[PDB]
């Protein structure tokens, strides 16, 4: 049971006249559904395929190729801590240990109440202020393991 809304369909069409190929709006349509629901369910792939005209296999391959498009359901807030080389020099291991101590989950798993989802990510473009952690609209920098409980309590 899936149905694209009028606003989502209008946004997808608005992205569609930007390019000369309706296939080129597949990533942006998936991101639109991602913003408007939090994850891409099973019927959303078929809905995007029906709206765009490309087959559902292409939309499924695009959704599963990119890491920032989620096909499994997540919590209200996602945690994307950087684990690349500069943040490894800056010591993201203490941040990961503090996150696993607080949330009592594993990287890739979600909490029982859906409060947070612990994920690693790629480079965040904030090497000079590493380590960095990406929440939905915030790029937290200069992370310390003592400040992790203070930072996690401001998101509900």
């Amino acid at each position: 049971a899936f149905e694209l809304s009028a606003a989502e369909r209008e946004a997808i069409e608005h992205e569609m006249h930007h390019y000369e190929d309706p296939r080129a709006a597949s990533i942006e349509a998936l991101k639109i559904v991602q913003k408007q629901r939090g994850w891409v369910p099973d019927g959303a792939i078929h809905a995007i395929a029906d709206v765009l005209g490309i087959p559902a296999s292409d939309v499924e391959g695009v959704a599963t190729f990119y890491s920032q498009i989620f096909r499994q359901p997540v919590g209200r807030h996602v945690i994307r801590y950087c684990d690349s080389v500069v943040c490894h020099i800056n010591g993201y291991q203490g941040i990961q240990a503090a996150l696993e101590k607080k949330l009592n989950i594993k990287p890739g798993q979600t909490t029982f109440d859906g409060r947070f989802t612990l994920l690693p990510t790629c480079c965040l473009g904030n090497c000079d202020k590493g380590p960095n952690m990406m929440i939905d609209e915030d790029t937290h920098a200069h992370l310390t393991p003592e400040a992790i409980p203070e930072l996690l309590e401001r998101y509900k």
């Binding site: 000369e20 296939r23 391959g61 890491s67 920032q68 020099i89 590493g130």
Partner: protein
């Protein structure tokens, strides 16, 4: 767009041009030129073998050229302040400037601009100011993770 800088009739020249911003979806391989072209078309970001070449058949088979942000920002200086003046900035085989800097357990990480021919030690104790207390120079990597 409200100032007429993009769209139709750009200051009476008649050249038609428009720019759109496409956000990525989190994959490192998208940075390659052929893979960027493939991901722009809405497919999986797989690179294309040479031959063919993206200058001949790039985005949707059309002529397409992809340039870096730093190259597209160095272009106005070359065009406006002359060509021979741009050649007279760095006296080496490479002509121009470059955004440079250090990162990772240093005193002053950041970004500055340096001409070609600058030695790597001149950013350590001058711009970065060295490292923190009790750290020995074991290794360094110049051009990112690759």
């Amino acid at each position: 767009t409200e100032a007429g800088l993009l769209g139709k009739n750009i200051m009476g020249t008649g050249f038609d041009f428009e720019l759109f911003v496409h956000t990525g979806a989190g994959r490192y391989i998208c940075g390659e030129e052929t893979a960027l072209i493939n991901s722009l078309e809405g497919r999986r970001a797989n690179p294309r073998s040479k031959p063919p070449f993206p200058a001949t058949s790039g985005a949707w088979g059309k002529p397409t050229c992809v340039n870096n942000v730093e190259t597209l920002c160095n272009v106005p200086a070359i065009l406006a302040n002359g060509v021979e003046w741009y050649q007279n900035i760095s006296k080496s085989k490479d002509a121009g400037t470059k955004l440079m800097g250090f990162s990772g357990r240093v005193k002053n990480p950041g970004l500055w601009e340096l001409p070609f021919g600058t030695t790597a030690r001149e950013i350590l104790e001058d711009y970065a100011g060295g490292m923190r207390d009790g750290l020995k120079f074991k290794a360094w990597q110049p051009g990112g993770a690759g």
